[PDB]
Design an enzyme around this catalytic site. Structure first.
Site, short mmCIF file in Angstrom:
data_model
loop_
_atom_site.label_atom_id
_atom_site.label_comp_id
_atom_site.label_asym_id
_atom_site.label_seq_id
_atom_site.Cartn_x
_atom_site.Cartn_y
_atom_site.Cartn_z
N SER A 88 0.78 -1.26 0.00
CA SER A 88 0.00 0.00 0.00
C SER A 88 0.83 1.34 0.00
O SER A 88 1.44 1.66 -1.02
CB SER A 88 -1.11 -0.04 1.05
OG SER A 88 -1.99 1.06 0.85
N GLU A 101 -9.43 -4.73 -3.73
CA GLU A 101 -8.68 -3.58 -3.26
C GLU A 101 -9.59 -2.50 -2.67
O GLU A 101 -9.14 -1.71 -1.84
CB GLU A 101 -7.85 -2.99 -4.40
CG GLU A 101 -6.72 -3.85 -4.90
CD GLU A 101 -5.54 -3.92 -3.93
OE1 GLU A 101 -5.45 -3.08 -3.01
OE2 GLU A 101 -4.69 -4.83 -4.10
N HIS A 135 -7.20 -5.20 0.95
CA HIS A 135 -5.76 -4.99 0.84
C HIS A 135 -5.11 -5.25 2.19
O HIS A 135 -5.72 -5.05 3.23
CB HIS A 135 -5.40 -3.63 0.26
CG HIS A 135 -6.15 -2.49 0.87
ND1 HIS A 135 -6.08 -2.19 2.21
CD2 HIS A 135 -6.99 -1.57 0.32
CE1 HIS A 135 -6.85 -1.15 2.47
NE2 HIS A 135 -7.41 -0.75 1.33
P1 LIG Z 1 -2.43 1.55 2.32
O1 LIG Z 1 -1.32 2.19 2.98
O2 LIG Z 1 -3.19 0.71 3.21
C1 LIG Z 1 -3.30 1.17 4.58
C2 LIG Z 1 -4.15 2.42 4.81
N1 LIG Z 1 -3.34 2.46 1.61
C3 LIG Z 1 -4.74 2.12 1.46
C4 LIG Z 1 -2.90 3.71 0.98
#
Ligand SMILES: *[P@](=O)(OCC)N(C)C
Ligand SMILES: *[P@](=O)(OCC)N(C)C
Lengths: 535, 533
Positions: free
Chosen positions: A203, A327, A440
């Site tokens: 992420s 996602e 995710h």
């Molecule tokens: P990722 O860092 O997942 C944790 C918030 N993201 C969705 C940007």
């Protein structure tokens, strides 16, 4: 020393460390936890680049995780594992620039490939010390040297007055870079091979990895890269200099506070004050948007990531990229009305049109019409199960799946070796409802091989599956190729190419090869939707 | 001196000819006049009723074909020639044909009335493919077809003027429909059960009688094959009709009254010479003189009229063929020919789209490309050639049809819908064109039942089915065969379920949604793009 374990004393450039011997399923590992790599970014150093850690005297005790960087703690669902697992598990402090090393026990005699983890958390949270980032399994089972660092998040890591001396922005990226430099100089002490350093992250961690790909001074610090469900390009990973200035000065207003006078005033504010207002500075009601993220400063990032992926030379680069099945589902419960962890979240057309304004907050009325037109199923346009899933798809595609395709494409065409995956297995333990599929973050515990711990309740096929994934990852780190060089029996994971656009499914079944990553849909997001924002 | 071939219509007596169909005799009444010849000062004018005649008029031969452009793109090729006039051209062309069972029906028989297509610039009721002997014989139908003015003669308008008010070709059709109310009983047709059917511009014409109140009392049901009154090609505004009319005038060397007078002094072929030089853009599936939104025949736009009309007591059968767009590609899209396989390049595809969607802005053009490109094979020429076909068919026919079918059903009409997917074995166009528009007609009309014509024996059984569907539809408002079961029923089209059937050699397959995703694009998104350039 004298009476203690000889495998646990190491010297690095700044001094002596005592590590700890840890139990893994199949035997012991060495862990050096909470090694400081920077001067504590406190007091007058808040918002500023990290300074290398001044040497210390005596043997520094490196047997426990250190502070977690100051951040927002989620409380949406108290007691609930699905959210709690991501929450800080050590004291919140601004003095948090520490890192962690796992190596085999005994340390290997010959230099070993190093894997460096960069955690996610939207650039407002995260910690190297969460259970799902436990390096012991990759260390014990695959003989890897694993390194993970804390880096500043939220305002502390990202508040920027672009152009100023006292808050240039991207300093969280710089903490990451400083830990990469620390690895270059010191990893050999641990039997790590500095000439074989692979960055992996998920992420905002993945977007982080891609920032280092695109930023020259970081380039010499690693050789290979893995980006799980995140990209430096796309709608959320960066803000312009103007927009960063805007959010920074608004936050300043919201707390009491010439750039020098403003920053100096921000520095006198208690950490909790900045966290309390962190969320009030976004231009629209949204999801998958974060207030303080990497800025296009014309320094760390010399241009927008979109520009640098298109015009960069990726000759020397082997890259693994991918996405999870769902996602978009995770954030729907944080702010699309209609959605909840506690029911099926069947929504109406009305809730879906509203959801689209929230999931695509930068869209005009026409652009949104286009999203809604595209993702509506015109046989069943009022059907609540489809709508609920289409809402997930919109958010997932816009923020992750299509950015990942844009990235995989540009990289392959600029001469990089790219391997692509979609992760499709839902943990037997998962506590989010079924409708959310594989949100995710839920591949992470498999990659790190947590199912190998027989005290953790995973199924036997999940234990085998985890081993498969650990093999792909460490093979990739070793060679730039996730494939097992002998084992020609198992089906091969081919490179992703612009001609064939191949990627593999990661699930309990053997590797299956598919073509095109939401190719039709991503033409919408990546080629068409920009133009509809020149009208 | 057969009394079966002798009929007194309102204008006097007619003598038909006894024709033979494979399974018996048919009475035919060919070239019956329904209007004063629209010549001299009557050019561009509404049709007047034919004056009564003395004695026995010979109605045993097809009359002249209305004056029109003749296609010479592939001279002597059966594919193009089958649409060309098979009789002398002439402005004196307002004639109709009646086929009836031999002997003339005991009781009043449902009537089918046929309206040829031809883009409102060509066509004739006398083509082999519109031969009504088969339907009359095998099914007992009373079949009527009429000539109507086309090109400038039928459709040139100076809207508001007295002397060229537009839509006269359509009024030609309406007069032939009036003629049927008044006279078909004499042939043993039932003026109380009249079903219009038409293809392409003929289907559009059918749709306009639906949307024009004075026509509504003249039929009871409608069949629209591959065309609609709504959509890009079938109508033009008054402004645009004035523009083309005045430009045609200037081009042939010519105040409304003065301008028309001058136009009337010109030889038919002089008008036709410049028919094709008045279109605002290079284009395909666009035609210079077409019905005009005149606030008279058509009180508002067909789109407005289908959104608000009340269709409670209407049965409608609508459909498309598998490849609505293939045919016109060879008439002006670079890279396309009947002779090779027209594997085109990506650049040819982008330039082909500005021709296929001529009213499309740069951005709209791009939406289309981006929609129709297969992103797994962005540059494969087979895909690109097939996508080109689909753009043109979808934009011009399939999506307009889907839109009409939805509106009619929502507003109370009983609608049945079909896709036709059988490529005739005798087809002389290359395979890549698939099933081009118009190549179902010969099957509906029952031409495969002619042993001499070399259709496969399956094709003959297919044709029988189709003739049964059409005539059942005429008889009852429902194409389903009461005597017959299980295998399977043709469900009404509805906005909810969106069910249509495939017409091919296999038994009926029921499908849902007619290019539903892609038509949402054309019917919902595309208007918004353009409106905001
Ligand atoms: P990722 O860092 O997942 C944790 C918030 N993201 C969705 C940007
Ligand atoms: P249709 O009338 O057929 C013309 C030859 N049409 C495509 C409008």
């Amino acid at each position: 020393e004298g009476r203690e374990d000889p495998q646990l004393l190491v010297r690095v450039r700044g001094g002596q460390l005592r590590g700890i011997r840890l139990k893994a399923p199949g035997g012991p590992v060495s862990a050096f936890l909470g090694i400081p790599f920077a001067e504590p970014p406190v007091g007058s150093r808040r918002f500023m680049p990290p300074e290398p850690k001044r040497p210390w005297s005596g043997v520094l005790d490196a047997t426990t995780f250190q502070n977690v960087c100051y951040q927002y703690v989620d409380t949406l669902y108290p007691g609930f594992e699905g959210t709690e697992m991501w929450n800080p598990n050590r004291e919140l402090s601004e003095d948090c620039l520490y890192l962690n090393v796992w190596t085999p026990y005994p340390r290997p005699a010959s230099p070993t490939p190093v894997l460096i983890w960069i955690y996610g958390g939207g650039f407002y949270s995260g910690a190297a010390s969460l259970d799902v980032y436990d390096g012991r399994f990759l260390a014990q089972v695959e003989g890897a040297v694993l390194v993970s660092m804390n880096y500043r998040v939220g305002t502390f890591g990202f508040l920027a007055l672009p152009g100023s001396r006292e808050a240039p922005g991207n300093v969280g990226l710089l903490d990451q870079r400083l830990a990469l430099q620390w690895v270059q100089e010191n990893i050999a002490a641990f039997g790590g091979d500095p000439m074989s350093v692979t960055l992996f992250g998920e992420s905002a961690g993945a977007a982080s990895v891609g920032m280092h790909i695109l930023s020259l001074p970081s380039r010499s610090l690693f050789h290979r890269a893995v980006l799980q469900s995140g990209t430096p390009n796309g709608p959320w990973a960066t803000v312009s200099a103007g927009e960063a200035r805007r959010r920074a000065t608004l936050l300043a207003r919201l707390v009491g506070c010439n750039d020098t006078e403003l920053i100096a005033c921000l520095r006198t504010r208690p950490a909790q004050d900045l966290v309390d207002h962190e969320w009030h500075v976004l231009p629209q009601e949204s999801i998958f948007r974060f207030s303080f993220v990497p800025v296009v400063d014309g320094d760390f990032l010399s241009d927008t990531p979109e520009a640098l992926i298109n015009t960069g030379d990726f000759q020397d680069l082997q890259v693994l990229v991918g996405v999870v099945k769902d996602e978009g589902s995770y954030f729907l419960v944080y702010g699309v009305p209609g959605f909840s962890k506690d029911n099926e979240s069947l929504i109406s057309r009305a809730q879906f049109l509203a959801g689209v304004r929230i999931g695509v907050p930068q869209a005009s009325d026409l652009a949104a019409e286009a999203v809604v037109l595209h993702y509506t199923d015109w046989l069943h346009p009022e059907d609540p199960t489809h709508l609920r899933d289409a809402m997930s798809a919109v958010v997932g595609d816009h923020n992750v799946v299509c950015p990942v395709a844009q990235l995989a494409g540009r990289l392959a065409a600029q001469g990089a070796r790219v391997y692509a995956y979609i992760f499709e297995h839902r943990a037997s333990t998962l506590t989010w409802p079924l409708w959310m599929g594989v949100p995710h973050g839920y591949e992470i515990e498999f990659i790190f091989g947590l199912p190998l711990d027989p005290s953790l309740n995973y199924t036997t096929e999940e234990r085998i599956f985890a081993q498969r994934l650990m093999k792909y990852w460490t093979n990739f780190a070793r060679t730039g190729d996730p494939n097992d060089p002998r084992d020609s029996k198992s089906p091969q994971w081919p490179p992703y190419t612009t001609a064939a656009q191949q990627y593999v499914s990661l699930n309990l079944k053997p590797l299956e090869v598919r073509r095109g990553l939401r190719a039709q849909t991503c033409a919408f997001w990546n080629r068409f939707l920009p133009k509809l924002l020149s009208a």
